[PDB]
From Swiss-Prot:
Full-protein residues shown: 126 to 388 of 403
Notes on activation and inhibition: Activation of CDK1, appears to be an upstream event of AURKA activation. Phosphatase inhibitor-2 (PPP1R2) and TPX2 act also as activators. Inactivated by the G2 checkpoint. Inhibited by GADD45A and p53/TP53, and through dephosphorylation by protein phosphatase type 1 (PP1). MLN8054 is also a potent and selective inhibitor. Activated during the early phase of cilia disassembly in the presence of CIMAP3. Inhibited by the small molecule inhibitor VX-680.
Reported impact of K37R: Loss of kinase activity
Protein name: Aurora kinase A
Subunit structure: Part of a complex composed of NEDD9, AURKA and CTTN; within the complex NEDD9 acts as a scaffold protein and is required for complex formation. Identified in a complex with AUNIP and NIN. Interacts with FBXL7. Interacts with CPEB1, JTB, TACC1, TPX2, PPP2CA, as well as with the protein phosphatase type 1 (PP1) isoforms PPP1CA, PPP1CB and PPP1CC. Also interacts with its substrates ARHGEF2, BORA, KIF2A, PARD3, and p53/TP53. Interaction with BORA promotes phosphorylation of PLK1. Interacts with CIMAP3. Interacts with GADD45A, competing with its oligomerization.
Length: 249
């Protein structure tokens, strides 16, 4: 099932930078709408990332869940790698957060639920996921989030757990705690001005809450941001948390 750049029509650029941009696209024969992610080869071999792509791709091609961005295929040419992706038309949770400043209790619980499901589903298939940033969280036609990064296996400090910065399975839970906080306060709990300092804050687990944060949210966030992995809830217990069930559509 060889795809080629001539089976598509490329349209408006959707987002940019680094390895290469993402263009909106439609397959000529069927008229299917989707996303083309373009990546210059040479420029990725020279960052030594070449190989991890093939694996995250292999991993993704067999992944199917309504809160995980679909990967339909890929192909290469002389110079370039192209990924054929599901298209999510409401943009990123990141840009939504910039627009609204901060989400409300209802939207947060909803997203955390949709993510928790997508991560339960992942674990069953012995797939485990690294850090999760809002940059990599897209929204579908019905406003539902989709995990859109290529970071699996069988986050410029902010989203990384203490395990990955000092010396699995529980990394996910830490991720939900960071995202859950950021949703309600509008910036991640360990944001600092330098790498050096963010590293100290995460390593020691230094955060405080603004005064608008209801006790229920404090209680969930504090359970998930524990230095020791084994003290973190299982995904299940997060799905059934008093504050979650009360607020999650
Ligand atoms: C992979 C994918 C993207 C997408 N839709 C979009 N992606 N990205 C984006 C942001 C940063 C970097 C790359 C793309 C967008 O800003 C965006 C904005 C409005 C509507 C849709 C999208 N659907 N599927």
């Amino acid at each position: 099932r060889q795809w080629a750049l001539e089976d598509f029509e490329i349209g408006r650029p959707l987002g940019k930078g680094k390895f290469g941009n993402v263009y909106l696209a439609r397959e000529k024969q069927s008229k299917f709408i989707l996303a083309l992610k373009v990546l210059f080869k040479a420029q990725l071999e020279k960052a030594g990332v070449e190989h991890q792509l093939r694996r995250e791709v292999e991993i993704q091609s067999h992944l199917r869940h309504p809160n995980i961005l679909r990967l339909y295929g890929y192909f290469h040419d002389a110079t370039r790698v192209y990924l054929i992706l599901e298209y999510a038309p409401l943009g990123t949770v990141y840009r939504e957060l910039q627009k609204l400043s901060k989400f409300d209790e209802q939207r947060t619980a909803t997203y955390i639920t949709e993510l928790a499901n997508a991560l339960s589903y992942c674990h069953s298939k012995r797939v485990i996921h690294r850090d999760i940033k809002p940059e990599n969280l897209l929204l579908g036609s019905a406003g539902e989030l989709k995990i859109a990064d290529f970071g699996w296996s069988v986050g410029t400090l902010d989203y990384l757990p203490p395990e990955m910065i000092e010396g699995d399975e529980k990394v996910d839970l830490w991720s939900l705690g960071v995202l859950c906080y950021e949703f309600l306060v509008g910036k991640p709990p360990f944001e600092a001005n330098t790498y050096q300092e963010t590293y100290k804050r995460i390593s020691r687990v230094e955060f405080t809450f603004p005064d608008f944060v209801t006790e229920g949210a404090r209680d969930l966030i504090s359970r998930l941001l524990k230095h020791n992995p084994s003290q973190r809830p299982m995904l299940r217990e997060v799905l059934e948390h008093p504050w979650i069930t009360a607020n999650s559509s």
